[PDB]
Amino acid sequence: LSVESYFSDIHDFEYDKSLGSTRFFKVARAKHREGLVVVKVFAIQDPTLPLTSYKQELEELKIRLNSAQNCLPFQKASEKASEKAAMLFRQYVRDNLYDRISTRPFLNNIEKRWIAFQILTAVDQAHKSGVRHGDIKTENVMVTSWNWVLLTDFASFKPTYLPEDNPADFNYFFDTSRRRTCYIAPERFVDRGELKRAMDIFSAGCVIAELFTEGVPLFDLSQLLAYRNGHFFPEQVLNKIEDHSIRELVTQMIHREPDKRLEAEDYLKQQRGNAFPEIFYTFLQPYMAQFAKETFLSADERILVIRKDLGNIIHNLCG
Amino acid sequence: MGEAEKFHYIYSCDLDINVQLKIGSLEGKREQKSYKAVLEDPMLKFSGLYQETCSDLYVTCQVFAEGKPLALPVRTSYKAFSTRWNWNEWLKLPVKYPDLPRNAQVALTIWDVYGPGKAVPVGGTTVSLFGKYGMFRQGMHDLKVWPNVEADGSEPTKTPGRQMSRLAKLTKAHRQGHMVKVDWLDRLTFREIEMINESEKRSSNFMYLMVEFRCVKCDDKEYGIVYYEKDGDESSPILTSFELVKVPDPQMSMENLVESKHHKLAR
Ligand SMILES: Nc1nc2c(ncn2[C@@H]2O[C@H](COP(=O)(O)OP(=O)(O)OP(=O)(O)O)[C@@H](O)[C@H]2O)c(=O)[nH]1
Ligand SMILES: CCCCCCCCCCCCCC(=O)O
Ligand SMILES: [Mg+2]
């Protein structure tokens, strides 16, 4: 079944585009009353499998991440929408960071810093809420056209632990871009656990690496398996990071032993001022949050909010 | 008995014609002839104040919005004055009704000769083009003239053209027929207004520039020009749903203009 075929049975969501077919999900862009939406359609080949376990999880991710301004959970889920398919619904964002890195205008250092700041803010938001994103990747970091980061596609249905012996489990659930990139924390490799906050910190650290290397992946599956065994360290790619302090944050976060990986809030404490401008904590995160989530401010009213606040904005950012 | 009460109007953004302003008469006296100042400045005897009772003054009309001029000033054509300043000239302004924002004003400056190649402002006056509820001013208006200054086009203007102030309005309303007529009472009351007016003539050296605005007529109807913007009826289809799309993006399905600028410069 083609990705579009599934939408023939649905009235409320009109097919728009395909984002990419993989044996795990077929992803389409759909037009909706509210805007554009990503529909991850899961062809449920074996009806014996209980999707009720995944539907519960996603409904508690949806509740916990309701107020997480930089997290975008799946907002809907439908076990039988096409009888042989399930579907996960979330808004569609302007960019995904992997593409944004290449689209113009190119991200400045200060914009990359703002994206890495908000990646750590998103991880911190979900982690405080009680949620883990079991695969952060640049594809899953989403960027509004005002550079609000939304972390999306929370990997609650993906396995926390993978065997190193059989790459079949990685190939199915992870690396749907088919880039062979591997940000799966090394201790997630063995030979239905719970996901750990340090398993996101390795994933997030590698995404900040790739962000600051202009898309050079820090590891692929063999390199992560070597790093897991201590036979490789990505010094070459880390030296493509142009900023020493983001380089050390990444080198901290990708640390091999999870015990040495702090909380996202700690990296944001340590990085105050030095990696992340003070103004990110004091003005831009709280000011920009008024545009962010379940907010209702029109393009016409956005410009009037920013015009009416120009003087205040100039003082905070500039002085 | 009377034509109906229907109020006809045109949107300002639909009336694509030049604004025209009649410069009527300049009533009032000038600043006498201070011969103290002439001893200090001998060039001052060679100025319209000191050469004729009515120098051949001219007015410049310029439209301002947000403190900026919308176009160049328009000058009254030369008219030789002997005993009264009465241009009686319709000036076609370089601005059209669609071009006028809600805070458009006309800054009117009366100019006089001050020696060779030098005009001095006799006075200035500024009046907003739309009224209190956004209707273009209609008919004959008498504007307070501020002595020895140019009309100020800044927002708010320092030379607004708008006892005798209140009475004149009532008098205009009476002459138009909006006030009820009571002959025995009008006869008595207007003598008092005349006394008030004469007292103000002697008390103050005020000048008034009477101007007029054109009347828009079609089939013997009167249309007021109300300020509007095209699409002003487009009440945005705002809806309060956030079931899936929690974070609206205004640039969502829009051409990337920074990539097209780049395409146009590389390719
Ligand atoms: N701009 C934009 N691109 C998206 C969006 N959703 C998905 N895509 C793109 O389409 C690709 C395919 O969709 P996904 O299945 O989510 O790809 P992915 O991030 O590798 O997916 P997972 O492996 O499940 O995390 C993504 O990598 C993105 O590049 C979106 O909301 N906005
Ligand atoms: C109604 C809830 C819909 C949930 C959608 C995600 C379900 C993912 C199931 C993954 C099954 C893996 C099967 C396999 O290992 O071959
Ligand atoms: Mg995804």
DSSP, residue by residue, chain B: -------EEEEGGG--SEEEEEEEEEES---TT-HHHHHH-GGGGGBHHHH-SS---EEEEEEEETTEESS--EEPPP---SS-EEEEEEEEEEEEGGG--TT-EEEEEEEEEBSTT-EEEEEEEEEESB-TTSBB--EEEEEEEEETSPPP-SSS-SSB---HHHHHHHHHHHHHT-SPP-HHHHHHHHHHHHHHHHHHHHH---EEEEEEE--EEETTEEEEEE---TTTT---------SS--S--TTTT---HHHHHHHHHH-
In angstroms, the CA A125 to CA A106 distance is: 27
Q: Residue B239 has which token pair? A: 């809806």
Angle CA A214–A217–A219, to nearest 5 = 155
Angle CA A296–A298–A304, to nearest 5 = 115
* A76 labeled part of a ligand binding site: no
Residue A222 vs residues A98, A128, A232: alpha-carbon distances, Å: 21, 32, 10
Q: What is the CA radius of gyration of chain B?
A: 25
In angstroms, the CA B249 to CA A291 distance is: 9
Residue in this structure with the two tokens 């070459």, named with its chain if needed: A236
Residue A35 zone, left/alpha/beta (φ > 0; ψ -120 to 50; rest): left
Q: What's the DSSP call for residue A5?
A: G
| Bridge partners, residue A91, by sequence | A37
Q: Residue A313 has which token pair? A: 């904005």
A176 lines ligand 1 (CB under 6 A): yes
DSSP class per residue in A258-295:
GGG---HHHHHHHTBTTTB-HHIIIIIHHHHGGGTSS-
The count of other CB atoms within 10 Å of the CB of residue A255 is 18
Do residues B40 and B110 lie in contact, with contact meaning Cβ atoms separated by under 8 Å? Answer: no
In angstroms, the CA B140 to CA B161 distance is: 13
Residues 6+ apart with CB under 8 A from B90: B20, B21, B22, B214
**Between helices A299-308 and A310-317, what is the axis angle to 10°?**
60
In angstroms, the CA B174 to CA B171 distance is: 5
Residue A258 vs residues A128, A217, A262, A263: alpha-carbon distances, Å: 18, 20, 8, 11
Q: Which amino acid is at B182?
A: V
The count of other CB atoms within 10 Å of the CB of residue A56 is 12
Angle CA A12–A14–A17, to nearest 5 = 145
A146 touches chain B (CB under 8 A): yes
| Bridge partners, residue B92, by sequence | B20
What three-state secondary structure class fits A221?
Answer: helix
Per residue, the 3-state secondary structure of A103-169, as one string, reads CCCCCCHHHHHHHHHHHHHHHHHHHHHCCCCCCCCCCCEEECCCCCEEEECCCCCCCCCEECCCCHH
Residues in chain A preceding a C-to-N separation beyond 2.5 angstroms (breaks): 191
Do residues A165 and A118 lie in contact, with contact meaning Cβ atoms separated by under 8 Å? Answer: no
A142 lines ligand 1 (CB under 6 A): yes
Q: What's the DSSP call for residue A92?
A: P
Q: What is the CA radius of gyration of chain A?
A: 20
Q: Residue A158 has which token pair? A: 């993906």
- Nearest CA-CA distance, residue B48 and chain A, Å: 48
What three-state secondary structure class fits A20?
Answer: strand
**Between helices A109-129 and A244-253, what is the axis angle to 10°?**
30
Do residues A133 and A198 lie in contact, with contact meaning Cβ atoms separated by under 8 Å? Answer: no
Nearest residue by C-alpha to atom 11 in ligand 1: A19
Residue B32 zone, left/alpha/beta (φ > 0; ψ -120 to 50; rest): left
Residue B41 vs residues B34, B118, B148: alpha-carbon distances, Å: 11, 15, 16
In angstroms, the CA A159 to CA A190 distance is: 12
* A17 labeled part of a ligand binding site: no
Distance from the alpha carbon of residue A118 to the mean position of ligand 1, in angstroms: 18
Q: Residue B5 has which token pair? A: 């009460």
CB contact under 8 A, B244 and A105: no
Please state the φ and ψ torsions of residue A37, each to the nearest 5 degrees. Answer: -145, 150
Question: Which resolution in angstroms does this entry have?
Answer: 2.7
Helix, strand and coil percent figures for chain A, each rounded to 5: 40, 15, 40
A51 lines ligand 2 (CB under 6 A): yes
* Experimental method of this PDB entry: cryo-EM
Do residues A36 and A29 lie in contact, with contact meaning Cβ atoms separated by under 8 Å? Answer: yes
Of B245, B259, B262, the CB nearest to A34: B245
What three-state secondary structure class fits A309?
Answer: coil
If we measure between CA atoms, which residue out of A172, A175, A167 comes closest to residue A137?
A175
- Cα-Cα-Cα-Cα dihedral sign, residues A63, A194, A230, A219: negative
Q: Is the peptide bond before A47 cis (omega within 30 degrees of 0)?
A: no
Q: Residue count of chain A, please give it.
A: 319
If we measure between CA atoms, which residue out of B159, B152, B142 comes closest to residue B68?
B152
In angstroms, the CA B68 to CA B162 distance is: 20
Distance from the alpha carbon of residue A139 to the mean position of ligand 3, in angstroms: 7
Do residues A95 and A143 lie in contact, with contact meaning Cβ atoms separated by under 8 Å? Answer: yes
Residues 6+ apart with CB under 8 A from A195: A132, A134, A160
If we measure between CA atoms, which residue out of A158, A116, A118 comes closest to residue A134?
A158
Catalytic residue among A16, A95, A124, A135: A135
Q: Residue B120 has which token pair? A: 């001095």
Q: Which amino acid is at B169?
A: K
What three-state secondary structure class fits A310?
Answer: helix
Residues 6+ apart with CB under 8 A from A180: A220, A221
In angstroms, the CA A115 to CA A121 distance is: 9
In angstroms, the CA A80 to CA A9 distance is: 11
Residues in chain B preceding a C-to-N separation beyond 2.5 angstroms (breaks): 162
Residues 6+ apart with CB under 8 A from B84: B25, B54
In angstroms, the CA B151 to CA B148 distance is: 10
Residue A191 annotated as catalytic: no
Please state the φ and ψ torsions of residue B84, each to the nearest 5 degrees. Answer: -160, 145
In angstroms, the CA A255 to CA A205 distance is: 9
In angstroms, the CA A304 to CA A80 distance is: 45
